[PDB]
């Protein structure tokens, strides 16, 4: 007589079988983690780690393993393009295999608890009826959680016993796994400081232990016990859901805005870095300093590493994909191979021209070549439209400094017009669109997909918190 | 495609084991009468 949407309510008053279903779920999650990790290794291409990072390859789970200090693989390749002399037991393949083994082990433990459901542990000594001491149980689990939180941030992050975490250059040029020294001053609260993660987990873990000890010793007041309906187990579900979707939102926001726990070299550049010209300002600052040293303008641009110039590209922008533009980033505009070098535009009479970069909002932006002052000089008519300042009439020319085509110059309107369109997209690159039959439409990076997935779940779980909260408070009327 | 091969082998072996164990589970024929 149970409708299709209450089939799982049979385990509400059955602690023995409640542990079983929770065990089975944990087995499914672990099975996914191992299977997904194995899937990504079979497709990852560790050849080029500069112009083809893993965030450019649509790898979702691989960044998370590498964030906590797993870099080598049993195939002899390291994430940084090294030789991987001593992969050890803990490698991408090993960790993925470990989860599957654990996934299977939990499956067996699930069957046992399902069959043996009636245990003397779940029976109240005073009365033979089944019962659960929720206030005390929460004390035990919180006590365990505090220890792990302290254990993680005291040994694994600080490098005392573990490897550490992934720290990186502000511009995501040099990155690696290093120990993190805890930061205790107010400086340790800014998001982009790795020291905060070590400091937080030490402090939060310690307080978790003290609170866990407290909730064991001190029983809830009679008023709260009845006001909060601590007897029922629904209240634990509704309140727990509330905490979960709070965590999802914080994780979603921290991922979208960037932080010390989501390095750009590991997950991909942020959207707001393109809006504010984060990398463009750095490149110009570096180039100008080189010019002041007395070096030529051609070699100054060659001094810019291709990694930095590959970030200054609108294609590497999480806010440019589509909802149904599925697949890896490389499937959008091919594989990035080679950097063609900074493009400099000049009109006939001498003034240099700059191409207005495409705002992140627009999907089709007109091509505008602006003078140093800002007045539009050269254009590209919409199509087959009467023109007064098109490339031909003003006859602008494009010169490449640095990169693959350093020193070359072009004047053919067809070629200049071709490179003008590429100029508004950021730095100019050469893409191999035949290996994967790339469509040409920008996809989204794992930063974009993670944020979308977890904000949607956060909203849906808000409804769940309301529904389960409503049933708890109004238990008598719903029950009968 | 290793994943497809593993999936197909798993399905095939599951079904074959089901077949064998099912034919084992039956009890021998006998005549209640006579």
């Amino acid at each position: 007589g149970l409708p299709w949407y209450r089939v799982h309510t049979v385990v509400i008053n059955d602690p023995g079988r409640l542990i079983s279903v929770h065990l089975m779920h944990t087995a499914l999650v672990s099975g996914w983690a191992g299977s997904m990790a194995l899937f990504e290794i079979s497709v990852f291409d560790p050849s080029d780690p500069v112009l083809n990072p893993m965030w450019r390859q649509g790898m979702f789970v691989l960044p998370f393993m590498t964030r906590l200090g797993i870099t080598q693989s049993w195939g002899g390749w390291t994430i940084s393009g090294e030789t991987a002399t001593n992969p050890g037991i803990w490698s991408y393949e090993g960790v993925a295999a470990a989860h599957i083994i654990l996934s299977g082990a939990l499956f067996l433990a699930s069957v046992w608890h399902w069959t043996y459901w009636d245990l003397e542990l779940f029976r109240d000594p005073r009365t033979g009826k089944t019962a659960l001491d929720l206030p005390k149980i929460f004390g035990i689990h919180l006590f365990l959680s505090g220890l792990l939180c302290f254990g993680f941030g005291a040994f694994h992050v600080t490098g005392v016993f573990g490897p550490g975490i992934w720290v990186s250059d502000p511009y995501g040029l040099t990155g690696r796994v290093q120990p993190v020294a805890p930061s205790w001053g107010a400086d340790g609260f800014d998001p982009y400081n790795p020291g905060g993660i070590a400091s937080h987990h030490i402090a939060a873990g310690i307080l978790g232990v003290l609170a866990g000890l407290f909730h064991l010793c001190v029983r809830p007041s009679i008023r709260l016990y009845f006001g909060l309906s601590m007897g029922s187990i629904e209240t634990v579900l509704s309140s727990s859901i509330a905490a979960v979707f709070w965590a999802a939102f914080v994780v979603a926001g921290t991922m979208w805005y960037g932080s010390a726990a989501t390095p750009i070299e590991l997950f991909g550049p942020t959207r707001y870095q393109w809006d504010q010209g984060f990398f463009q300002q750095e490149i110009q600052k570096r180039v100008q300093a080189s010019l002041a040293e007395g070096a030529s303008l051609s070699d100054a641009w060659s001094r810019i590493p291709e990694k930095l110039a590959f970030y200054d590209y609108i294609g590497n922008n999480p806010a440019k994909g589509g909802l149904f533009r599925t697949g890896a980033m490389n499937s959008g505009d091919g594989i990035a191979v080679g950097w063609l070098g900074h493009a400099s535009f000049k009109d006939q009479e001498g003034r240099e021209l700059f191409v207005r970069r495409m705002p992140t909002f627009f999907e089709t932006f007109p091509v505008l070549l602006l003078d140093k002052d800002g007045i539009v000089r050269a254009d590209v008519p919409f199509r087959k439209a009467e023109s007064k300042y098109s490339i031909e009439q003003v006859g602008v020319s494009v010169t490449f400094y640095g990169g693959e085509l350093d020193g070359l110059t072009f004047t053919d309107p067809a070629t200049v017009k071709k490179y003008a369109r590429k100029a508004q997209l950021g730095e100019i690159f050469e893409f191999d669109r035949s290996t994967l039959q790339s469509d040409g439409v920008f996809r989204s990076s794992p930063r974009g997909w993670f944020t979308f997935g977890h904000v949607c779940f956060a909203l849906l779980f808000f409804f769940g918190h309301i529904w389960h909260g409503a049933r708890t408070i109004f238990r008598d009327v719903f029950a009968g | 495609m290793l994943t497809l091969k593993i999936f197909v082998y798993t399905v095939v072996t599951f079904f074959v084991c089901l077949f064998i164990f099912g034919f084992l589970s039956n009890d021998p024929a006998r005549n209640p009468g006579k």
């Binding site: 067996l108 069957v111 | 290793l2 593993i6 082998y9 798993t10 072996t13 084991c17």
Partner: peptide
């Protein structure tokens, strides 16, 4: 060796459930 591994896994699973 995929055959051997798969068969060993399926047989072990069934036996373990029973035991």
């Amino acid at each position: 060796p995929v055959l051997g591994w798969v068969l060993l896994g399926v047989f072990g699973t069934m036996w373990a459930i029973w035991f």
